[PDB]
């Protein structure tokens, strides 16, 4: 008896009945204990004696054994105990070997990380992926990870070790071909990694989520070639109520918080600080095997960010056999600011970027039906390289409504460089243009339409304060075609502007071009007493359909025409009134209108 009770089967010979209930199951102590399971149950030497965790012990083989055993039982949750730091100090083996895998996740085996997991000095200067859900070296020959949840109040610490080379990959949790998997509550911190979490693989996966997780200082070296904290690469997956922070200078140039790469994915309720970018929202053709070649229903909403580059970078590219498409996106409720910095010191500040592909090609995209609404954007007044939308690649549609944009540019693209084809750009008049950059815009165009062409587009400029420093509210170079488009400049705060709307190739004369903007016109009248016509002295208003006065008449003996039309020769003509006769000569501020 004493032999049995002191042996490992001793709890299995001690009876128990729930709260002495006569109806309850007659069990043994071991049975109630077998309901839960922890790392302590596999953290032992060959002779079954428990090993204590610490900086001089590799917990990898033990945690792996635990995962492998519970995998056999059909599932369950392993606890990684609180009040202990569990150091990992070696590479995993078999299926995860090809992915630099430390621990292999398995279906139905959840990890409750309450304690801390720290990478040992073994992993300094080399690649690693701390948790991997692939069961094969080649991911195309891998099976799925299902129903695997990592959660708790625990920490995952990458040791603070730098990358050994730019080519190396480093990840916290690679769920792999992951269906119904999540990370909740976990702090990932102190490292130099490519991602902290990757969800899915080339579209394979579903219902994967990252929630209430923290991501702190996950870039620290100039070697690090790129970073995206959470990579969503399966559909019906997303990031929610998370926190992302960086302090590293290098992070401001390379780090993005989230990437959405498949349909029905989201990023919301999250706070970001110290990153270059908020989110990539893209279809990479090379990732279209699992969930097809379209990224639709892409949601970036109610996020808070202090970034140094671009907030949302839209993108779409092609392979030889597959073409990427992006459509039905929504960016709403976000309050974003470019952080304090020198002009041109980080990648170009923007709220929306229509970026080219990895290879720098700008003539492969298919971005359309994008709604940008109810967002707040601010950039410090000194930051020249700041824009509401940086439009550097072919755009098939994007709609801006009821946003608040307080930065240097509204619409922008560098002169030279790319020559984007633009369709269906809608800038509703409900977008407010802020005044922080007033007086800073010497020689610059508020909307600098540096494109190959613009069609089926609306730009309704409305100012809410003066900036007479800008060269124009909106400018089109002669190289930019314009047709079936609406371009207006509201007169408010524009009276003293020499240029409002500028069409360098006279593109506002287009048969289906709808424009209105203020201009200053010199008029001469005939000498006739009574009703008398006034004509403009310049002859470049052949495109004008109507014009009306925006200035007072300080004269008593006459009044120029309130409204005007044009003549074959490009003069404006109206009918004023001479109370007394005499040739009149005035300079008046007119709202020039064409088919509007």
**Which residue in the set 169, 452, 550, 573 belongs to the binding site for Na ion (CB under 5 A)?**
452
* Least CB distance to a copy of itself at residue 451 (A): 17
Residue nearer to a copy of itself on the CB measure, 320 or 552: 552
Does 338 sit near a copy of itself (CB under 8 A)? no
Question: Is residue 337 at the binding interface for a copy of itself, with CB under 8 A as the rule?
Answer: yes
Euclidean distance between CA atoms 350 and 363, whole angstroms: 21
338 neighbors 307 (Cβ within 8 angstroms):
yes
Given the structure tokens 């929630």, which residue do they identify? 211
Which uninterrupted H or E stretch holds 68?
helix 60-73
Q: Residue 510 annotated as binding?
A: no
- Binders of a copy of itself in range 402-441 (CB under 8 A): 402, 404, 406, 424, 426, 428-430, 432, 434-436
By CB under 8 A, residue 187 contacts a copy of itself: yes
Distance CA 193, CA 221 (A): 10
Strand partners, 586: 523
Nearer to a copy of itself, 418 or 500 (CB): 500
Query: Among 363, 439, 464, 479, which residue interacts with a copy of itself (rule: CB under 8 A)?
Result: 464
Query: What is the per-residue DSSP string for 454-490?
Result: EES-EEEE-BSS--TTBSEEEEE-TTSEEESEEEEE-
Burial class (CB in 10 A: 0-12, 13-18, 19+), 183: buried
What character string, x for contact with a copy of itself (CB under 8 A) and - otherwise, covers 233-262?
---x---xx-x-x-----------------
Of 198, 486, 501, 525, the residue at the interface with a copy of itself (CB under 8 A) is 486
- Sign, CA torsion 280/284/289/292: positive
Binding of a copy of itself by 57 (CB under 8 A):
no
Pairing of strands 572-578, 558-559: antiparallel
| Cα(536)–Cα(28) distance, integer angstroms | 104
Residue closer to a copy of itself by CB (options 8, 443) is: 8
Q: How many residues bind a copy of itself (CB under 8 A)?
A: 167
Q: Which of residues 492-551 bind a copy of itself (CB under 8 A)?
A: 492-493, 495, 512, 514, 528, 530-533, 542-551
Q: Select 73 or 522, whichever has its Cβ closest to a copy of itself.
A: 73
Q: Per CB under 5 A, does 421 bind Na ion?
A: no
d(CA 260, CA 268): 12
Compute the C-alpha angle 279/461/451, nearest 5°.
60
Binding segment toward a copy of itself, per CB under 8 A, in 95-103, 195-203, 340-348, 491-499:
491-499
Residue 416's binding partner out of Na ion, a copy of itself, none, with CB under 5 to 8 Å set by partner kind: none
Binding at 414: pick from a copy of itself, Na ion, none (beta carbon under 5-8 Å per type): none
Query: Which chain residues interact with Na ion by CB under 5 A?
Result: 452
């Amino acid at each position: 008896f004493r032999a049995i009770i002191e042996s490992p089967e001793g709890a299995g010979h001690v009876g128990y009945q729930y709260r002495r209930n006569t109806g309850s199951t007659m069990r043994m102590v071991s049975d109630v204990l077998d309901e839960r399971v922890s790392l302590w149950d596999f953290h032992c030497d060959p002779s079954g004696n428990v090993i204590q965790p610490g900086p001089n012990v590799d917990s990898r083989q033990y945690l792996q054994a635990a995962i492998d055993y519970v995998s056999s039982n059909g599932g369950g949750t392993i606890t990684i105990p609180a009040g202990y730091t569990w150091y990992l100090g070696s590479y995993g083996v078999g299926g995860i070997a090809g992915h630099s895998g430390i621990i292999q996740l398995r279906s139905n085996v959840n990890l409750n990380i309450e304690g801390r997991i720290h990478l040992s000095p073994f992993f300094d200067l080399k690649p690693f992926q701390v948790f991997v859900g692939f069961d094969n070296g080649d991911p195309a020959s891998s099976g799925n990870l299902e129903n695997c949840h990592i959660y708790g109040h625990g920490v995952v610490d990458f040791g603070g070790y730098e990358f050994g080379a730019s080519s190396q990959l480093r990840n916290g949790v690679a769920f792999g071909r992951s269906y119904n998997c999540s990370v909740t509550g976990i702090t990932f911190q102190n490292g130099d990694v490519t991602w902290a979490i990757t969800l899915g693989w080339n579209g394979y996966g579903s219902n994967c989520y990252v929630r209430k997780c923290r991501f702190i200082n996950l870039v620290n070296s100039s070697v690090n070639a790129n970073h995206s904290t959470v990579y969503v690469n399966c559909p019906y997956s997303g990031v929610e109520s998370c926190y992302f922070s960086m302090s590293s200078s290098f992070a401001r140039n390379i780090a993005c918080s989230v990437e959405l790469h498949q349909h029905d994915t989201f990023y919301r309720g999250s706070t970001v600080n110290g990153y270059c970018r908020g989110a990539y929202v893209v279809m990479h053709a090379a990732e279209a095997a699992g969930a097809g070649s379209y990224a639709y229903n892409m949601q970036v909403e109610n996020n808070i960010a202090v970034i140094y580059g671009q907030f949302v970078i839209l993108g779409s590219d092609v392979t030889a056999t597959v073409s990427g498409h992006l459509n039905d996106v929504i960016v709403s409720g976000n309050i974003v600011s470019i952080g304090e910095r020198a002009a041109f010191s980080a990648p170009f500040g923007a709220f929306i970027d229509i970026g080219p592909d990895n290879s720098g090609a700008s003539n492969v995209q298919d971005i359309q039906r994008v709604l940008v609404t109810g967002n707040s954007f601010y950039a410090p007044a000194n930051i020249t390289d700041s824009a509401a939308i940086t439009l550097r690649a072919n755009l098939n549609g994007c709609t801006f409504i009821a946003n608040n944009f307080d930065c240097r540019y509204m619409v922008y693209n560098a002169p030279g460089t790319t020559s984007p084809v633009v369709q269906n750009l809608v800038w509703d008049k409900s977008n407010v243009i802020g005044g922080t950059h007033a007086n800073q815009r010497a020689g610059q165009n508020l909307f600098d339409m540096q494109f190959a062409s613009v069609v089926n587009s609306t730009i309704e400029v409305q100012l809410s304060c003066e900036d007479l420093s800008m060269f124009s509210c909106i400018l089109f170079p002669a190289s930019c075609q314009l047709s079936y488009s609406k371009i207006t400049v509201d007169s408010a705060w524009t009276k003293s502007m020499s240029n409002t709307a500028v069409f360098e190739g006279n593109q506002q004369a287009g048969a289906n071009v709808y424009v209105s903007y203020p201009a200053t016109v010199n008029l001469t009248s005939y000498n006739t007493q009574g009703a008398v016509p006034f004509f403009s002295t310049d002859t470049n208003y052949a495109w004008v359909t109507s014009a009306y006065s925006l200035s007072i008449n300080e004269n008593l003996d006459f009044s120029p025409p309130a409204t005007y039309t044009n003549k074959a020769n490009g003069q404006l003509v109206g009918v004023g009134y001479n109370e007394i006769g005499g040739v009149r000569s005035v300079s008046v501020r007119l709202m020039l209108q064409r088919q509007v």
